Amino acid sequence: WMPAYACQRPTPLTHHNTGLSEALEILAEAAGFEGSEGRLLTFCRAASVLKALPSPVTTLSQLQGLPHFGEHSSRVVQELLEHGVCEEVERVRRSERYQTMKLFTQIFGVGVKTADRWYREGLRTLDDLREQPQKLTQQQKAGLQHHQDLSTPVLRSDVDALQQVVEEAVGQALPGATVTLTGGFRRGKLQGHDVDFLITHPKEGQEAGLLPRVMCRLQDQGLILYHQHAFERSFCIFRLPQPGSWKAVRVDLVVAPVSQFPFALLGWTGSKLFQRELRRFSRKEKGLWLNSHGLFDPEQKTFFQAASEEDIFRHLGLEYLPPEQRNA
DNA sequence: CGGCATACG
DNA sequence: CGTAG
Protein backbone atom coordinates (compact mmCIF):
# COMPACT_ATOMS: atom_id res chain seq x y z
CA TRP A 1 0.00 0.00 0.00
CA MET A 2 2.81 2.41 -0.90
CA PRO A 3 2.08 3.97 -4.33
CA ALA A 4 4.95 4.15 -6.78
CA TYR A 5 4.77 7.89 -7.59
CA ALA A 6 5.59 10.48 -4.95
CA CYS A 7 2.61 12.61 -5.98
CA GLN A 8 0.24 9.76 -4.99
CA ARG A 9 1.13 9.86 -1.29
CA PRO A 10 1.46 12.50 1.43
CA THR A 11 5.04 13.33 2.40
CA PRO A 12 5.31 15.53 5.51
CA LEU A 13 8.26 17.78 6.20
CA THR A 14 9.33 15.83 9.28
CA HIS A 15 9.07 12.06 9.46
CA HIS A 16 10.26 8.83 11.11
CA ASN A 17 13.19 7.74 8.94
CA THR A 18 15.39 10.83 8.80
CA GLY A 19 18.77 9.13 9.10
CA LEU A 20 18.00 6.51 6.48
CA SER A 21 16.63 9.05 4.00
CA GLU A 22 19.66 11.30 4.49
CA ALA A 23 22.04 8.45 3.65
CA LEU A 24 20.20 7.61 0.43
CA GLU A 25 20.20 11.32 -0.50
CA ILE A 26 24.01 11.38 -0.18
CA LEU A 27 24.22 8.62 -2.78
CA ALA A 28 21.70 10.46 -4.96
CA GLU A 29 23.74 13.66 -4.81
CA ALA A 30 26.96 11.78 -5.62
CA ALA A 31 25.26 10.12 -8.59
CA GLY A 32 24.33 13.58 -9.87
CA PHE A 33 27.91 14.76 -9.48
CA GLU A 34 28.93 11.98 -11.88
CA GLY A 35 26.14 12.60 -14.38
CA SER A 36 24.11 9.50 -13.50
CA GLU A 37 20.65 11.05 -13.56
CA GLY A 38 18.88 7.68 -13.51
CA ARG A 39 20.66 6.50 -10.39
CA LEU A 40 20.08 9.92 -8.79
CA LEU A 41 16.35 9.57 -9.42
CA THR A 42 16.16 6.08 -7.92
CA PHE A 43 18.05 7.07 -4.75
CA CYS A 44 15.88 10.21 -4.42
CA ARG A 45 12.71 8.14 -4.92
CA ALA A 46 13.80 5.50 -2.40
CA ALA A 47 14.64 8.21 0.13
CA SER A 48 11.24 9.81 -0.43
CA VAL A 49 9.43 6.50 0.09
CA LEU A 50 10.93 6.35 3.59
CA LYS A 51 9.77 9.91 4.29
CA ALA A 52 6.22 8.77 3.53
CA LEU A 53 6.23 5.82 5.95
CA PRO A 54 4.12 6.10 9.13
CA SER A 55 6.83 4.80 11.48
CA PRO A 56 10.53 3.90 11.61
CA VAL A 57 11.99 1.07 9.61
CA THR A 58 13.57 -1.28 12.15
CA THR A 59 14.06 -4.49 10.14
CA LEU A 60 15.08 -5.23 6.55
CA SER A 61 11.82 -7.19 6.20
CA GLN A 62 9.83 -3.96 6.19
CA LEU A 63 11.37 -2.91 2.84
CA GLN A 64 9.87 -5.85 0.96
CA GLY A 65 7.25 -4.64 -1.45
CA LEU A 66 8.23 -0.98 -1.12
CA PRO A 67 8.73 0.65 -4.54
CA HIS A 68 12.24 1.77 -5.54
CA PHE A 69 13.99 -0.56 -3.07
CA GLY A 70 16.15 -3.13 -4.82
CA GLU A 71 19.48 -4.74 -3.96
CA HIS A 72 21.48 -1.50 -3.67
CA SER A 73 19.14 0.70 -1.61
CA SER A 74 18.18 -2.28 0.56
CA ARG A 75 21.84 -3.02 1.31
CA VAL A 76 22.37 0.62 2.34
CA VAL A 77 19.46 0.42 4.78
CA GLN A 78 20.55 -3.00 6.06
CA GLU A 79 24.01 -1.69 6.98
CA LEU A 80 22.63 1.38 8.72
CA LEU A 81 20.20 -0.80 10.68
CA GLU A 82 22.84 -3.34 11.69
CA HIS A 83 25.86 -1.06 12.23
CA GLY A 84 24.65 2.55 12.36
CA VAL A 85 26.76 3.50 9.32
CA CYS A 86 26.97 2.50 5.66
CA GLU A 87 30.53 2.12 4.41
CA GLU A 88 29.66 3.25 0.88
CA VAL A 89 27.99 6.41 2.20
CA GLU A 90 30.94 7.22 4.48
CA ARG A 91 33.39 6.70 1.61
CA VAL A 92 31.42 9.19 -0.51
CA ARG A 93 31.27 11.67 2.36
CA ARG A 94 35.04 11.55 2.89
CA SER A 95 35.99 11.72 -0.78
CA GLU A 96 37.75 14.75 -2.20
CA ARG A 97 35.58 14.53 -5.30
CA TYR A 98 32.30 14.63 -3.37
CA GLN A 99 33.41 17.42 -1.03
CA THR A 100 34.72 19.66 -3.81
CA MET A 101 31.82 19.10 -6.20
CA LYS A 102 29.47 19.89 -3.31
CA LEU A 103 31.37 23.08 -2.49
CA PHE A 104 31.54 24.24 -6.10
CA THR A 105 27.96 23.40 -7.11
CA GLN A 106 26.56 25.29 -4.12
CA ILE A 107 28.01 28.50 -5.61
CA PHE A 108 25.31 30.52 -7.38
CA GLY A 109 26.23 30.41 -11.09
CA VAL A 110 28.10 27.09 -10.94
CA GLY A 111 26.45 23.85 -12.03
CA VAL A 112 27.67 20.28 -12.14
CA LYS A 113 29.32 20.70 -15.53
CA THR A 114 31.32 23.76 -14.48
CA ALA A 115 32.29 22.29 -11.09
CA ASP A 116 33.45 19.11 -12.81
CA ARG A 117 35.61 21.03 -15.27
CA TRP A 118 37.20 23.04 -12.45
CA TYR A 119 37.81 19.81 -10.52
CA ARG A 120 39.60 18.25 -13.48
CA GLU A 121 41.66 21.45 -13.83
CA GLY A 122 42.89 20.84 -10.28
CA LEU A 123 40.89 23.49 -8.40
CA ARG A 124 39.66 22.58 -4.92
CA THR A 125 38.81 25.67 -2.81
CA LEU A 126 36.86 28.90 -3.11
CA ASP A 127 40.11 30.81 -2.77
CA ASP A 128 41.44 28.82 -5.74
CA LEU A 129 38.55 30.32 -7.70
CA ARG A 130 39.05 33.85 -6.40
CA GLU A 131 42.66 33.75 -7.62
CA GLN A 132 41.58 33.63 -11.31
CA PRO A 133 38.49 35.87 -11.47
CA GLN A 134 38.70 36.84 -15.14
CA LYS A 135 37.70 33.19 -15.67
CA LEU A 136 34.39 33.74 -13.85
CA THR A 137 31.06 34.89 -15.20
CA GLN A 138 29.55 37.95 -13.54
CA GLN A 139 26.91 35.65 -12.03
CA GLN A 140 29.67 33.45 -10.59
CA LYS A 141 31.53 36.49 -9.26
CA ALA A 142 28.36 37.45 -7.39
CA GLY A 143 27.83 33.94 -6.07
CA LEU A 144 31.41 33.81 -4.82
CA GLN A 145 31.44 37.28 -3.26
CA HIS A 146 28.16 36.49 -1.46
CA HIS A 147 28.81 32.81 -0.80
CA GLN A 148 29.19 33.13 2.98
CA ASP A 149 25.89 34.96 3.47
CA LEU A 150 24.11 32.69 1.03
CA SER A 151 25.24 29.69 3.08
CA THR A 152 23.35 31.03 6.16
CA PRO A 153 19.70 29.93 6.46
CA VAL A 154 16.88 32.39 5.83
CA LEU A 155 14.38 32.49 8.72
CA ARG A 156 10.61 32.95 8.53
CA SER A 157 11.10 36.38 10.22
CA ASP A 158 13.28 37.33 7.25
CA VAL A 159 10.59 36.25 4.80
CA ASP A 160 7.87 38.51 6.20
CA ALA A 161 10.17 41.54 5.94
CA LEU A 162 11.15 40.76 2.35
CA GLN A 163 7.53 40.11 1.37
CA GLN A 164 6.62 43.60 2.56
CA VAL A 165 9.31 45.33 0.52
CA VAL A 166 8.42 43.28 -2.59
CA GLU A 167 4.74 44.15 -2.20
CA GLU A 168 5.63 47.85 -1.99
CA ALA A 169 7.52 47.76 -5.28
CA VAL A 170 4.91 45.55 -6.95
CA GLY A 171 2.12 47.90 -5.87
CA GLN A 172 3.85 50.87 -7.48
CA ALA A 173 4.67 48.85 -10.58
CA LEU A 174 1.10 47.65 -11.08
CA PRO A 175 -1.65 48.52 -8.59
CA GLY A 176 -3.69 45.45 -7.76
CA ALA A 177 -0.89 42.99 -8.44
CA THR A 178 -0.44 40.36 -5.75
CA VAL A 179 2.55 38.62 -4.18
CA THR A 180 2.32 34.99 -3.03
CA LEU A 181 4.97 33.20 -0.98
CA THR A 182 5.91 29.92 -2.65
CA GLY A 183 8.78 27.44 -2.43
CA GLY A 184 9.80 25.65 0.75
CA PHE A 185 8.28 28.17 3.14
CA ARG A 186 4.86 27.46 1.65
CA ARG A 187 5.47 23.75 2.39
CA GLY A 188 5.95 24.71 6.06
CA LYS A 189 9.73 24.99 6.31
CA LEU A 190 10.93 27.22 9.14
CA GLN A 191 14.20 27.94 7.30
CA GLY A 192 15.31 28.10 3.69
CA HIS A 193 18.19 28.78 1.32
CA ASP A 194 16.18 31.41 -0.57
CA VAL A 195 12.76 33.01 -0.72
CA ASP A 196 10.39 32.40 -3.66
CA PHE A 197 7.59 34.79 -4.66
CA LEU A 198 4.91 34.45 -7.34
CA ILE A 199 3.36 37.62 -8.73
CA THR A 200 0.16 37.96 -10.72
CA HIS A 201 -2.76 40.32 -11.36
CA PRO A 202 -6.50 39.45 -11.34
CA LYS A 203 -7.05 40.97 -14.82
CA GLU A 204 -5.56 38.68 -17.49
CA GLY A 205 -2.89 40.48 -19.50
CA GLN A 206 -2.19 43.26 -17.00
CA GLU A 207 0.86 41.35 -15.75
CA ALA A 208 2.60 41.59 -19.14
CA GLY A 209 5.82 43.55 -18.76
CA LEU A 210 5.60 43.63 -14.96
CA LEU A 211 8.89 42.11 -13.79
CA PRO A 212 11.25 44.73 -15.30
CA ARG A 213 9.15 47.43 -13.62
CA VAL A 214 9.36 45.59 -10.30
CA MET A 215 13.09 45.05 -10.50
CA CYS A 216 13.85 48.62 -11.53
CA ARG A 217 11.97 49.84 -8.46
CA LEU A 218 13.69 47.41 -6.09
CA GLN A 219 17.07 48.43 -7.51
CA ASP A 220 16.30 52.13 -7.10
CA GLN A 221 15.48 51.44 -3.44
CA GLY A 222 18.99 50.04 -2.99
CA LEU A 223 17.75 46.53 -2.22
CA ILE A 224 19.27 44.55 -5.11
CA LEU A 225 22.85 43.40 -4.76
CA TYR A 226 22.68 41.30 -7.93
CA HIS A 227 20.32 40.46 -10.75
CA GLN A 228 20.73 39.61 -14.40
CA HIS A 229 19.43 42.94 -15.78
CA ALA A 230 11.32 41.08 -21.44
CA PHE A 231 11.48 38.41 -18.73
CA GLU A 232 9.28 36.58 -16.23
CA ARG A 233 11.74 34.94 -13.79
CA SER A 234 14.35 36.91 -11.83
CA PHE A 235 17.06 35.19 -9.73
CA CYS A 236 18.23 37.95 -7.40
CA ILE A 237 20.42 38.61 -4.39
CA PHE A 238 18.66 41.03 -1.99
CA ARG A 239 19.96 43.15 0.89
CA LEU A 240 18.09 42.08 4.02
CA PRO A 241 18.28 44.09 7.27
CA GLN A 242 20.01 42.58 10.31
CA PRO A 243 20.90 44.08 13.72
CA GLY A 244 23.18 47.02 12.94
CA SER A 245 23.89 45.70 9.44
CA TRP A 246 22.45 43.48 6.70
CA LYS A 247 22.97 40.19 4.90
CA ALA A 248 22.66 38.93 1.35
CA VAL A 249 19.69 36.66 0.61
CA ARG A 250 18.68 34.82 -2.55
CA VAL A 251 15.19 35.79 -3.74
CA ASP A 252 13.35 34.47 -6.80
CA LEU A 253 10.58 36.55 -8.36
CA VAL A 254 8.23 34.99 -10.91
CA VAL A 255 5.33 36.49 -12.86
CA ALA A 256 2.41 34.51 -14.27
CA PRO A 257 -0.89 35.50 -15.86
CA VAL A 258 -3.80 34.70 -13.60
CA SER A 259 -4.98 31.95 -16.01
CA GLN A 260 -1.66 30.16 -15.40
CA PHE A 261 -1.32 31.07 -11.73
CA PRO A 262 -2.46 27.67 -10.32
CA PHE A 263 0.09 25.86 -12.50
CA ALA A 264 2.87 28.26 -11.52
CA LEU A 265 1.92 28.04 -7.85
CA LEU A 266 2.01 24.24 -8.02
CA GLY A 267 5.37 24.16 -9.75
CA TRP A 268 7.08 26.79 -7.59
CA THR A 269 5.78 25.25 -4.35
CA GLY A 270 7.64 21.98 -5.09
CA SER A 271 9.25 19.95 -3.84
CA LYS A 272 11.53 19.39 -6.84
CA LEU A 273 11.01 15.63 -6.67
CA PHE A 274 7.26 16.11 -6.21
CA GLN A 275 7.07 18.16 -9.42
CA ARG A 276 9.17 15.70 -11.44
CA GLU A 277 6.98 12.85 -10.22
CA LEU A 278 3.77 14.79 -10.91
CA ARG A 279 4.84 15.57 -14.47
CA ARG A 280 5.93 11.97 -15.01
CA PHE A 281 2.61 10.72 -13.63
CA SER A 282 0.69 13.14 -15.85
CA ARG A 283 2.43 12.03 -19.03
CA LYS A 284 2.94 8.33 -18.44
CA GLU A 285 -0.28 7.46 -16.56
CA LYS A 286 -2.75 10.05 -17.93
CA GLY A 287 -1.30 11.00 -21.32
CA LEU A 288 -1.30 14.69 -20.37
CA TRP A 289 1.64 17.11 -20.53
CA LEU A 290 2.17 19.24 -17.42
CA ASN A 291 4.40 22.22 -16.79
CA SER A 292 4.33 25.40 -14.73
CA HIS A 293 2.19 27.12 -17.38
CA GLY A 294 -0.56 24.60 -18.02
CA LEU A 295 -1.76 21.07 -18.65
CA PHE A 296 -2.09 19.96 -22.27
CA ASP A 297 -4.15 17.14 -23.78
CA PRO A 298 -2.08 16.21 -26.88
CA GLU A 299 -4.99 14.23 -28.37
CA GLN A 300 -7.63 16.98 -28.40
CA LYS A 301 -4.90 19.64 -28.61
CA THR A 302 -6.49 21.58 -25.75
CA PHE A 303 -5.30 23.16 -22.50
CA PHE A 304 -7.08 22.51 -19.22
CA GLN A 305 -8.39 25.59 -17.47
CA ALA A 306 -7.61 25.60 -13.79
CA ALA A 307 -8.82 28.04 -11.15
CA SER A 308 -7.00 26.31 -8.27
CA GLU A 309 -4.39 23.71 -7.43
CA GLU A 310 -7.38 21.58 -6.39
CA ASP A 311 -8.55 21.70 -10.03
CA ILE A 312 -5.19 20.39 -11.23
CA PHE A 313 -5.14 17.40 -8.88
CA ARG A 314 -8.70 16.59 -9.97
CA HIS A 315 -7.72 16.87 -13.64
CA LEU A 316 -5.00 14.29 -13.02
CA GLY A 317 -7.19 11.94 -10.99
CA LEU A 318 -5.08 12.42 -7.86
CA GLU A 319 -6.22 13.00 -4.32
CA TYR A 320 -5.42 16.55 -3.26
CA LEU A 321 -2.29 17.13 -1.21
CA PRO A 322 -1.74 20.43 0.60
CA PRO A 323 1.70 22.04 0.24
CA GLU A 324 2.77 20.67 3.63
CA GLN A 325 2.39 17.12 2.28
CA ARG A 326 4.40 17.70 -0.93
CA ASN A 327 7.78 17.36 0.82
CA ALA A 328 8.86 14.44 -1.33
C1' DC B 1 15.24 -2.77 -23.22
C1' DG B 2 13.82 2.54 -22.76
C1' DG B 3 12.84 5.76 -19.62
C1' DC B 4 13.89 8.87 -16.16
C1' DA B 5 10.19 16.73 -16.01
C1' DT B 6 10.14 20.57 -18.13
C1' DA B 7 10.56 24.98 -18.35
C1' DC B 8 13.17 30.25 -18.60
C1' DG B 9 17.70 33.72 -18.52
C1' DC C 1 26.06 27.09 -19.93
C1' DG C 2 23.30 28.95 -15.86
C1' DT C 3 18.68 29.20 -13.13
C1' DA C 4 13.81 27.24 -11.00
C1' DG C 5 10.52 23.88 -8.39
Next chain:
DNA sequence: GCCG
Protein backbone atom coordinates in the same frame (compact mmCIF):
# COMPACT_ATOMS: atom_id res chain seq x y z
C1' DG D 1 19.03 1.93 -9.84
C1' DC D 2 14.97 0.60 -10.46
C1' DC D 3 10.18 -0.12 -12.98
C1' DG D 4 7.12 -1.67 -16.29
